[PDB]
Amino acid sequence: PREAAAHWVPFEDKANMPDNVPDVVEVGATSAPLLSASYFIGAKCKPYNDDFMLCREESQGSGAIDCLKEGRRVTRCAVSVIEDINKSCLDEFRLHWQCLEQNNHQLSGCRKAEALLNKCVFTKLNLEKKIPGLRPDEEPVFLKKDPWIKPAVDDFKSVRAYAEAKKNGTL
Amino acid sequence: TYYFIEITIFLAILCTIFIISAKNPMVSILYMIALFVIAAMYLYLIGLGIFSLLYIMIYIGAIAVLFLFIITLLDINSTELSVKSNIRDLPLVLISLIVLTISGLMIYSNDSILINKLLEAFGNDYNTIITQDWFNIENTTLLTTIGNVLLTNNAFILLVLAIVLLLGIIGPISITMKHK
Amino acid sequence: INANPGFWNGPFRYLRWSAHNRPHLFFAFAIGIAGPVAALTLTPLRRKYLYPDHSPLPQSYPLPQRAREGLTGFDD
Amino acid sequence: LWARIYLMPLLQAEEDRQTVRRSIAQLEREKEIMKGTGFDVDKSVYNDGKFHAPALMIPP
Amino acid sequence: TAAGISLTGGRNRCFSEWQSFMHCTAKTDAKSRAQCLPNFEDYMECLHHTKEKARLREIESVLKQKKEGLEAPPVKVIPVKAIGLV
Amino acid sequence: MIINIVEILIFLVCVLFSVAYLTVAERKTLAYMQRRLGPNFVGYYGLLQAFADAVKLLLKEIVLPKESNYIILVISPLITLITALIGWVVIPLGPGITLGELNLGILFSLAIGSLGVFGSLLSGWSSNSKYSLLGSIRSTAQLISYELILTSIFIIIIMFVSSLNITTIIETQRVVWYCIPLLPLLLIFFIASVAETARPPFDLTESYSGSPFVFFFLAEYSNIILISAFNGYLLLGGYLSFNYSYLFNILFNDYSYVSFLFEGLINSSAYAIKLVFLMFSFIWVRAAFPRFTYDNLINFCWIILLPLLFGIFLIIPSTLYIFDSFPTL
Amino acid sequence: SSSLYRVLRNAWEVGPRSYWKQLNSIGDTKSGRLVGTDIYGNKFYETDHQDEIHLRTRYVEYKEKDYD
Amino acid sequence: SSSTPLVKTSVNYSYGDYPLIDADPHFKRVVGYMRPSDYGVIGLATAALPAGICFAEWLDPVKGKFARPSVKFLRVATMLGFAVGFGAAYARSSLRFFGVTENAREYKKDEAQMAARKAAGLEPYGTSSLTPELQEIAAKNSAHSIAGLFIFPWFNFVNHPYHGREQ
Amino acid sequence: MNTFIIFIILIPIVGFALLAVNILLAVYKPYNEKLGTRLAFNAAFILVAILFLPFDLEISTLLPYVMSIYLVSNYGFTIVLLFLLILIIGFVYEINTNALKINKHNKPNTDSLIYK
Amino acid sequence: AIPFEALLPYGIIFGLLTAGGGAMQVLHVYRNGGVRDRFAIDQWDSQMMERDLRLNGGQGRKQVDQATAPEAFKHNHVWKSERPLI
Amino acid sequence: MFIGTIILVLSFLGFVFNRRNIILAFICLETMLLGINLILLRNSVLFDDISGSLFAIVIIILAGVESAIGLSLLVSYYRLRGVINSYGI
């Protein structure tokens, strides 16, 4: 919760899970693919994530050990979403997070690639990108036309793919 | 680069001894400015990078400037550290050094026992384990939370503090004007 | 030479006098009191006509208040 | 903000499993240290039975 | 007040032990306070880590005298240049 | 480790050349404003004259008077040289191009600018004469009196960003600069910047040899370009010129080192053209105006500018309040 | 004038050889007529060009590198 | 959402003989519910400060023989008299909300008003432009601030959800 | 090991080098003719730097607020308004008293020419 | 009209700062490995950068996108042990 | 806690055995306040909370105001006596 100062030295641990708890395979996506598919991880895995944090609230202070069985399932369902999005939308998911690794991982600067990614994932994986807590009479930010905050330079691959999706009639 | 805190502790000792024994009154004040810099070094060292620049801005840039500004246009006599003057002081200096030092080290401890109170101040050797938890989603740094709690939970302290700043305006004026 | 009439002998005449002869103090106090008076009197008009207020940003993970109802998914 | 809280339980489960594994590893390690000598390493110094990650290790 | 507010505006490190102690002290009147002695103890050594320092000194006193030292899954130290190297 | 030391000696060679040529530039445009030529005697068109002057003044006799602390008198040049130069880290020549990217950059730029008062006041205690003291008193009194309103304008600008990072302010200024809404603040900040160096619009105390002279000389013009840098990032656009996305989608096809080279050229050309127009305006206001009495100066700061600044303190959070527009971290 | 066009066209009229010597002698660029030379050897020039100020029409090119 | 109090709170914990109305009333409700005797207290204090200065001059004059005080003193006396009278009337009227003085005139007005706000289909204490965390902190600041009227004036202007009542 | 600290240590190297170059390079050769109580001051001189500090402490008291400005929205705004106005009242004290003036001691001697 | 000589030292000031900014941007991109710098880094994004250095294998911001994480990823996890703070 | 304790103790004893001038007493007072700051900010870091940071940011301002007040007090001490004695007030 506080960060290490004044000569911290890092250390790691040559050990294993005990036999009591089964194997769980991990998430291997880094920040730009994780930030790219964050809304679709949240759209599919909402009741699993909320049961995990509700576990953590319910049995206070035990925490780690009494919530492992649902921390299993949140990781497995997010892995399901990520390979689902790989095998359907690999090239434009890659287009999106390759836009996102420039521009400080700001979602504000990658609108023309995220329109393509949202259209693919919505027609093929049937998951929708939504911002909750947003009452009506309020436009969502990634839908608006001519925003005030444009990026410095639009990425070339995504504006080329965006124009070709215009002329195909994809989007 | 392990012994950094120890080095700042030692250099702070040495700087205070140069403060209290100095030819010229403003040689002593420049040693105080150096002690402020050693303080800000320790504060960045422990993890408080905000406070160190607050110390350099407020203490060095306003209080030391006011102090040097006073020494310039006022006349202050000074004796220097004669040995005839001050080794009459030294036996009580030594007794009070050891007593006040041990006694300041005493109150971090909870024992019935006197020197178990003392040597738990030196039981320092264990290296704190820093864990990452992903529960915080935004850049609330320390100045943000000081601005939240000066302004919501301790808003009355901020307004009584405004009265104190008001007094720091009114008082020096009220002394030094000689109204007509 | 221009003397001070005082705020009390004539109010609006003193306001005109201060605007002509002490313009830094008059316009400093003008800009100063334009702030909180419009903060009082204009923001209900904006909430009525221009646009209502934004919804609050989340600060933590949002915990709902339920009892971990059983879900048949990822039983493996 | 909503993106980060969609990502939070996914990484929290991660660091929870890392905490459980390394703490049980340290517990077994000091059990393997003080074999022979009668001493309880499994016992918490906290009086409540809740689980806690260890701190304050000896520098290597 | 700023009773349990941390540096990030969250709850501090010993908030949960303190809130357990206050849950204790809310449902008790005096003449009956001797039973919430453990919670307070749990709070105080949350603050100062006195019993953990005592326990770790007791175990370090034993590992200093072994010729064998450590027969365990050991712990590695890395440079900061090499967190994910291999 | 080859990378950062080559980067820092590239930055040092750029800024310590550009503080030398600012001197050659002020003599030439002061001359042409006065309808005469500048120097053309020492270079092909007058250049490396600051080099000629530095070459000669590092040959000049140093006089340490009867009256003087010798140590205090020659390390007040260095403490003013070093803190007039330390503030050159945090300025960005592009998004994230500083010598140290720290999240509290304005707090640093504001703490170093308060360290610059000492080498006036302290060096009054050098050569202790009764007139060598109260002139330094008037100097330091003006210095602190105008860094007050400097700090004030900074905190007014941070009411729009709510972040002490500096390139965050410049990325925030992409939608509009901060001079276009707050143009009285550009006027107030320009005159406070002119006072903070004690430029000869706002000079009174003017009106050594060798190393204590060239250190003060370099500190003066480094302070010129440093407060010009402060104006360039928080009030004008820092490295921002226009959109230049359509021009790139014409020219380039993918990220290459020549494209990053071209983008850095455009960004720091915008930053440098702001800074150069600002230094020209410093010399241009030097050319046209007489100087101040101390009483006109103190009356100006404490009685005229500061109440107006209190009005600005009240007016700007109130309009950020009327329309529900508070900046988020 | 103070123009760049004037120094431009005078540098083109006088030529680069003569430009480098006139840059190593004076700061200006001047296009003359060679009215005559000295018994010491000092070429003199008169400039008829329109954008000249009073007291600039006539000048000397010396012989030695230390000139009087 | 924006009216759940999320704390535990006194329920009808009356501070005197008489039942409470609010645990801190809003400023508008205090100005709305004050009696003609309270406006008489405001007028009494507005009259008593300049008359008091004239009186204390008539007792012991400043420069030896009696003059009236200047009008510059009488106007500041009347301004501070309105300040004393408004502090007195606000404290008097807040006492009726707490149930330490007689409030049967105002208890009828509050049951009428909360019945009207149930009939109008809106929230019982007002929609506020604050997050519920800030409403809670803002009402911890102004809770029972009528004690300590001698030191500082402090009022309630936040429409926070809890007032020491049920349902 | 960042590019921040080479600067911190390298600017002195710049200075130490240059004043070395002159002290190492130039003529010293001084003599007596080349080499070479207390006065009273007005109150506004000492006053400008004494009253400087309470305004400076206010300006760095705004610095926690303008970083927290979103979180305390509509509430910390009014607390800051009251803070600023409480200090504006001490400032209008200061400029109503004409404190920071140094005023000239000799007039035209306005008093008229009467006779007998 | 416009003196070219007056504006040439401004021209060299402009050119020196322009070339410095361009050379420094390419030095930053060469340090990152072909991408731009991150100009404002949260505590969250600091933790995210160290996690991605753990996941990619050695490299700074290579930014792997893999289905499921490797074998040494469960074992290369780091805690930080900070000194006594005397 | 060591650095704040020793700067406070050495600052205190330098204040107490000051016989040479008056401004050493002022600067020993300010360094005492610095040592109190050091101890408190370390405790705030170790306990993971802002409340020691709250008392520290308030005592910074109070130390500044006391320096302003007391140095105007010294100036008024100096008004009637154009000298400040070495032995003390």
Coordinates of C-alpha atoms in Angstrom, one line a residue, chain F residues 4-127:
Chain F
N4 CA 22.0 9.0 -20.3
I5 CA 25.4 10.6 -20.1
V6 CA 25.5 11.3 -23.8
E7 CA 21.9 12.7 -23.4
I8 CA 22.9 15.0 -20.6
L9 CA 26.0 16.4 -22.2
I10 CA 24.0 17.0 -25.3
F11 CA 21.5 18.9 -23.2
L12 CA 24.3 20.8 -21.4
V13 CA 26.1 21.7 -24.6
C14 CA 22.8 23.1 -26.0
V15 CA 21.7 25.2 -23.0
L16 CA 25.2 26.5 -22.1
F17 CA 25.8 27.5 -25.7
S18 CA 22.4 29.2 -25.9
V19 CA 22.9 31.2 -22.7
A20 CA 26.2 32.5 -24.3
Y21 CA 24.5 33.5 -27.6
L22 CA 21.7 35.3 -25.8
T23 CA 24.3 37.9 -24.8
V24 CA 25.4 38.4 -28.4
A25 CA 21.7 38.7 -29.4
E26 CA 20.9 41.3 -26.8
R27 CA 23.8 43.6 -27.9
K28 CA 22.8 43.3 -31.5
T29 CA 19.1 44.0 -31.1
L30 CA 19.7 46.8 -28.5
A31 CA 22.0 48.3 -31.2
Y32 CA 19.4 48.0 -34.0
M33 CA 16.7 49.4 -31.8
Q34 CA 19.1 52.4 -31.3
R35 CA 19.9 52.5 -35.0
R36 CA 23.5 51.3 -34.9
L37 CA 25.2 48.1 -35.7
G38 CA 25.9 45.5 -33.1
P39 CA 29.3 43.9 -32.8
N40 CA 30.8 42.7 -36.0
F41 CA 34.4 42.8 -34.9
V42 CA 35.1 39.4 -33.5
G43 CA 33.3 36.8 -35.6
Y44 CA 32.4 36.7 -39.3
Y45 CA 29.1 38.5 -38.5
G46 CA 29.9 39.3 -34.8
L47 CA 29.5 35.8 -33.4
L48 CA 31.6 34.2 -30.6
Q49 CA 31.8 37.6 -28.9
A50 CA 30.5 36.1 -25.7
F51 CA 33.4 33.7 -26.2
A52 CA 35.8 36.6 -26.6
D53 CA 34.5 38.2 -23.4
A54 CA 34.7 35.0 -21.4
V55 CA 38.2 34.2 -22.8
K56 CA 39.3 37.7 -21.5
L57 CA 37.5 37.6 -18.2
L58 CA 39.0 34.3 -17.3
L59 CA 42.3 36.2 -17.7
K60 CA 41.2 39.0 -15.3
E61 CA 42.7 39.9 -11.8
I62 CA 40.5 38.9 -8.9
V63 CA 40.4 41.4 -6.1
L64 CA 39.4 40.2 -2.6
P65 CA 39.0 43.4 -0.5
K66 CA 40.1 44.3 3.0
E67 CA 36.4 44.2 4.1
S68 CA 35.5 40.8 2.9
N69 CA 34.9 37.2 3.7
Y70 CA 36.9 35.6 1.0
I71 CA 35.1 32.2 1.0
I72 CA 31.6 33.7 1.2
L73 CA 32.4 36.1 -1.7
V74 CA 33.6 33.4 -4.1
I75 CA 31.0 30.6 -3.4
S76 CA 28.0 33.0 -3.6
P77 CA 28.8 33.1 -7.4
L78 CA 28.7 29.3 -7.4
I79 CA 25.5 28.8 -5.4
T80 CA 23.8 31.3 -7.6
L81 CA 25.4 29.6 -10.7
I82 CA 24.4 26.1 -9.6
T83 CA 20.7 27.0 -8.7
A84 CA 20.3 29.2 -11.7
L85 CA 21.3 26.2 -13.7
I86 CA 19.7 23.3 -11.7
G87 CA 16.2 24.4 -12.8
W88 CA 17.0 23.3 -16.4
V89 CA 16.2 19.7 -15.7
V90 CA 12.4 19.8 -15.6
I91 CA 11.6 21.7 -18.8
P92 CA 10.3 19.4 -21.5
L93 CA 11.4 19.7 -25.1
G94 CA 8.6 17.4 -26.1
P95 CA 6.4 14.9 -24.3
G96 CA 8.4 13.3 -21.6
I97 CA 11.8 14.7 -22.8
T98 CA 13.3 16.1 -19.6
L99 CA 16.5 15.2 -17.8
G100 CA 14.3 13.9 -15.0
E101 CA 10.7 13.0 -15.3
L102 CA 9.4 13.5 -11.7
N103 CA 5.7 13.9 -11.0
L104 CA 6.2 17.1 -8.9
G105 CA 8.0 19.2 -11.4
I106 CA 6.5 22.6 -10.6
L107 CA 7.2 22.1 -6.9
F108 CA 10.8 21.6 -7.9
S109 CA 10.9 24.6 -10.3
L110 CA 9.3 26.7 -7.5
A111 CA 11.7 25.5 -4.8
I112 CA 14.8 26.2 -6.9
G113 CA 13.6 29.7 -7.8
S114 CA 13.4 30.5 -4.1
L115 CA 17.0 29.4 -3.7
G116 CA 18.2 32.1 -6.0
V117 CA 17.7 35.0 -3.6
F118 CA 20.6 34.1 -1.4
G119 CA 23.4 35.0 -3.8
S120 CA 22.1 38.5 -3.8
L121 CA 21.6 38.9 0.0
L122 CA 24.6 36.8 1.0
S123 CA 26.9 38.7 -1.3
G124 CA 25.9 41.9 0.3
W125 CA 27.7 40.6 3.4
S126 CA 30.7 40.4 1.1
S127 CA 32.7 43.6 1.4

